[PDB]
Every structure is written in structure tokens, then in C-alpha cells.
Amino acid sequence: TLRAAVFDLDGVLALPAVFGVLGRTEEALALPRGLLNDAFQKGGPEGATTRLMKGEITLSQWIPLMEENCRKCSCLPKNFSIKEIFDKAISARKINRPMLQAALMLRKKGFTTAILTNTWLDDRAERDGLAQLMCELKMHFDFLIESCQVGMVKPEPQIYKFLLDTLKASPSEVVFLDDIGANLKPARDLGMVTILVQDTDTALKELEKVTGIQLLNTPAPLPTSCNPSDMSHGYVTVKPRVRLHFVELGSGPAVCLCHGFPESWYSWRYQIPALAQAGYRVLAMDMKGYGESSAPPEIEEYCMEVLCKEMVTFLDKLGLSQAVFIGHDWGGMLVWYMALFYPERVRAVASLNTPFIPANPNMSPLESIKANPVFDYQLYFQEPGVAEAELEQNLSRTFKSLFRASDESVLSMHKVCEAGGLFVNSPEEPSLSRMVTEEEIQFYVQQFKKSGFRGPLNWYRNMERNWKWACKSLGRKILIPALMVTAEKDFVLVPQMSQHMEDWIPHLKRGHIEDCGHWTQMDKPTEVNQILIKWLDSDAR
Template sequence: MQSSRTVSANRVEIFLTEQGQGPLVLLCYGWPELSYSWRHQLPAIAEAGFRVVAPDMRGFGRTSAPADINAYSIFELVGDMVALVAALGEKQAVIIGHDWGAPVAWHAALFRPDIFRAVAGLSVPPPFRGRGRPLDTLRDSGITNFYWQYFQTPGVAEQEFERDVGFTMRAVFGRGFSNPAASLFVEKGKGFLGDPSIPRQLPEWITEQELSHFIEAFEKSGFRGGLNWYRNIDRNWELTAPWQGAQIHQPSLFIAGSNDSVITGLIGAKRIMELERVLPNLKQRLIIDGAGHWIQQERPAEVNAALIDFLKANAGQA
């Protein structure tokens, strides 16, 4: 049976949904989502013989949202997952992340290989720490309208997204980052979402009832917590200096959609070809043809099959 509760970990209150018995599996989602994003994975992974836990991440949903921007660094986000494993009474887990949850999963495996015995990332490749701070690198390349940059000033994106949360969620899920890479750039005066007078159709993979879970949650919480993750991008680069060139040696899996501009555009295309530089124990690179960014919601059967095969083969490895 699936159940939900709140646990204290790393000085925050973490709301989670859990199901099943067996080796622990943590599911970390990205922006702007909720633990509900894993609704198709929880029962399937539990039925396959695992204890699967999907938390609302720091700053989202029913989990604490500290006011301090610095409280959303990669150290705090990974710290939440480390503390959550202990709060659940376990010593080890497999960690799986999508979108922003993927960097959390990759860094959790990098920082604490004693706890995270295997790792899977969806849509966002593992960390390739460049020579300079990411936002500086963008600016030095002449780029001033990438969405990371638009998200930096507190209050700007919040105002746009909170004006009509229903429209926001339709626009973000509907675009799916599946258009050309221009979808990751913000046209001056139009904001991230584009013209609000243009109706947005829901994609086939989400129903009105499912969308209502996201709308209700973000109407209550607002968007600041999740946006603060982006406001630590340069700080995360600074904090992770000791791991320059480090590899993740645990068994790993990467899944993405072929139409996801995160892997085809400015940042990701080169990284997909070089996964083994960071993941020498990569078990599978699965690119799902025709799929977009919200991969575990959009193509649950294929994602579940790959995750379960990976878990059955690797969850028992210390």
C-alpha cells in the first residue's frame, strides 16, 4: 500500500510518499514538479521488490522552504537525501533523479558512495565541472537571455509564474523543452512562458485531474523555493571545486528523450557523447525516440522497464 508522511531530516521537514518493501530507492524530481511526478514509477518499482520513496524536495510542495537562498546549494540538497536515508532507518539506497533531481542524484553518488550504491539520471547528464562559473561562462559567450539568467533575480520569475499558476503549469508541461533549443531562451518582454493570451493545450501524457495536483500545490507554495535552486548554480560550481574531474564509479544509468532540448541544445549534446568520462560504470544510455523532457511521466512503461532492470541488477551491490 502507498502511504505518505513527513519526516525531519537535515533541519527541514520532508514530505514523502512511499510504497513497497526491499532495498531502498529514492526518487528525486526536478523543476517545477512534485513527488507526484513519480506516480507511475512508485507502484511499478514497489511491485518489483523495492521500498521506493519519493520526497517533495526542499522548497517544493509540503516540504520546508527556507527563506535563505544559500539554503538551496547542492550540499544542502544532497544533505537532505543523506539524512533522509538515515531517517528511513536505512544505511544504503539507490538514488534516481530527473531534471534538477538528476544533479542531486549524481552528486549524492559522487559525495557519498558509501550510501548510494547505484545511481540513475533522467534528462540531465552527470556533472562536467567546467573551467569557470556557469553564469559567467554564458555571459562571456555573449549569451544574456538563457533561462538560467532570467531566473536569477528574486521576484522576477516568481511574479510571472504566480500570476496564473494554471497557465504556468500548462505552458511548462506543454512546451516540454521538446522544441528547438530556443525554448530555453527568454525573448525580451515575453517572459519564460511566452504570450499568456495564447491558450496552451495539455500534452497527451497528463490529464486535467493530474495537472490539478501541481496547480493546487504551487498555488499554496509559490515558486520561490524551486527557483532558488537555480540561484545557486555559480555557488555550486565554487563548492564542488574538490571534485574537479572526479568520476562516479557506482553502477549508473542514463535515460532521456530524443526530443529533449536539454540534451540536444546548448548544454547537453556534447555531454551525452561523453557520459563515460564521468560514469565509467555506465550500464545503459537509453535515448527514447520521440520523447520529450518530462520523460517518466510521458513514457512511463519504457522508463519503468529500464529502471527496474537496472535496480534488479545493481541494487544489491555494496
């Protein structure tokens, strides 16, 4: 009975195979068949290629030794370059997405997975491309065994015994996939299940049959998520009693993610790997009042003016002249204010669900809140302690009742005051939404054990303060790159609420997500990622 799957890189996890190029070069250049491919394998275990594959020499040291082997094998053309051929071939090689999906599905079903590859130590000026591919691929597997690192090579039988030792599994427990029959033989000869990879589909039909797990024609997979303990955790003191926590991933332009109420940096779990993979440095915050960020008790510590001033200090301390700001719910409001009050520090601005609405100088904000029935819950949140007591009574119940898709809801946010609470017509043991696992609920539960709901609720307790500050920006317009993302089924932050935004943001770009509730990021992660990456690459460098 199988419990581990082993994949080759070239021709299996990455396509087109680099061997396929040696052949294509001969054909395009009308060279004798296998002239280049025979030069590549000259001397066998004694040859330059084995030394390269074992890690004895680097790729740049091997280039002129291959140039010698192709000369002795052959006449060759005028400006023929081994460097150019390999550079083009490596650069053209991309991840074989359906093969990676199968490895992800097998790992999700309890398998130990590994990449076993004959590769080199790459010191070419263009080595980053490959470095990137390996970095992306490797994080999806339990083990990455590289010939040049272990000083062993396929087909030598010691690399297989090394493989079985790292896996801590007997050969009959292991499936091995390879495009080279010769490299497949010692695994077969040892009793491992083997699959010769030509076309991916046939290879996956063989893999499905042999494991008893559906891998082909599977429903669309969710984006890569975050394991909290595997992240880089960052901490910046913005003032004597205030430290802000953030999770950090990737390189490139800085992207600041700002969650809403009652959330976490973890609400961006499906966006963080996606955006880092797209070429951005992601800073997913724990907003003030939340998780590992400080939570002072004073109401005024949570007015937009101070929240924004602290986010500017956060940048100053990290040495960032700008960041793109992306917010959701209360974070979406903060992000529109960063754009209005600190445009020099905001590269671009994006909001999920939260529209930009100018302050009404002729109306009290609590009159304005009363005018919209769905904003009743915000009046229930005013009285210090009332909502803290209900929300803190049973954390698991709080998150399970809140975090539900549009077709699952147990909460109506109108007539909350009259009803006497948010969960008064809600079950004691709500069912688990399709959006979350029990473990994901338990992470929010553990986060909220530290400070609870006082700091988070205080964000709502500065209506008049925020309104007076906001009135200072009434003559301004938002003229920096801006994205507004609406969610069809957000029954509080309705798409219609964003209808007059181009009056204050004339060059505004838009995104819209159908059949999406309030919890945009975990409801429709795939689409959020597509809309954000697309707008980032076009409007935010």
C-alpha cells in the same frame, strides 16, 4: 443496462487454473483419470474442501485430510506429495494480463468491478507468493469477496445475494465471468449476464458484445498511476526549520526518486506502483521547496551542498544505510552529487535527461550558462521575484504551458530574457497536453499554492556556490553502478550533452528514449519503467 462486472480468480483472473494441475498430475503419473480431482471434491458440502473454502479450517490443516481422500479414492507412487503438487501449482499461477486489462477498462468507463472467489486461508510456509498475487490484483477492483472470509461458497445462492448487496446493484446490472458452469448457474438463474470462461479471447469477445465497450485489440494501456489520498505519506525533520515529505510504496531495496523543476513526488506517479511491483521500496520525494516539504526563503538553503547533506540526514533518520538514487532534471544533478560526495550511502545512481558534467575551474558558471542559448531561461530565473511573479500569476496556465510533449510545445527557452518572460508568446488558456488530465494539472496547481515558486527557483540561484563545491570533486570518478537515460527530444537537456560521461563514469550504463520530450516520466512511462526495472534488477540487488 450493465454497470458492474464480477470476475472469478482461478481460470479467469489467474492462469493456469489450479484444477488444470489435478488433471495434469494424473496424466504425468499415469494415475486413473479424475482420481485426484474426485478426492478434491469428496463429501461435497460436508467434505474437507467445503470446510476449507468456507474458512472453517486452514490450508495446512486440509493438506492431510486431502491425503486421506486420495488414499480412499485409490495404487499411489513412492514420494507422492499433495503439498508439493499444490505448492508448484500455486507458484505457476500468474495474473491473466488481458483479463485484468478488460476489468481495468470497464472500471475506467464507470463500472463497479469485483473479484468473487472460492479460496482458502493460506498458512503454508510459501503463502507469500499468493499474498503478493492477491495484493497486486485486489487494488485494481472495488471489491474482493473471498469464500473463506465470508463463510459462504459458490454455488450456494446466499453468496450471490451477498454479492448483489455489496455491489448495491440489481442482477440485470451485473456481468459475471466464471470458468465453472455450476458456479455460473445461480448468477444466471437470478438474472445476471453470465459468461462461461474457457479461452480468454472468446470470453472477452462475449464481454465486449455484452457491455458495448471495446476490450480486445485496444491500444497499449498506460502503467498504473497513483491516487495521492491512497498513499502512505511520510515526514522526516532534517533540521529545525526543514521537514521533507515523501510518498512510500513497496518492500525491498530502498529507491529514492528525486524530481526536477517545477515538479512534485507526483511526477513519478507511473513509476511508483511499477517499481514497488518489481520488488523495491520506493521513496518518492517532495524535494526541498516543494509540496508538503518545507520551503525556507533564503537562497543558500538550496545550494547542492546543503540539499545533499539534508538527503544524507533523511536516510540517517529513516535508518537507511543506503538507497538507490534516481533523479530527473534538477534531481538528476543532485543524484550525481550524492554519488560523488556520499558514495557509501548510494547503492546505485540513475539520471533521466540530466547528464553529469564536471565543473569548469577556468570558467565562471554564469559565463558557461551564457555560452548555451537554450539555457537563457536560467538567466531569466536569477533575479529574485521576476520569475516568481510570472510563474505564480496563473498556476493552471504555468503547468499547461510547461507540461507538453515534443510535438505540442508552446515554449522556446532561448531569447526569454530579450522577450521579457517565459510565457510572453504563450496563450492565456493553453490547450491540455495528451500527457496530462485536467485533474493532474489541478494537483500541481494545489501543491504550488502552499509555497509557490520561490524555493523551487532558488535551486537555480546557487551557480557560483555549487561550482566552488563541485570543483572539490574534480580528481574523483564515479565508480558505483550508474545509469544515464537520454530523451531524444529534450531540447534543453539534449542527449549529446551526455557524450563525455564515460570519462568520469567508466562503467556507465545507458538507456535512450526516442520521441521523448523533457517530461520523461509522463511522456514515455512504459519505457522509463522498462529501462529502470531492468537496470535495477541487474545492478542494484
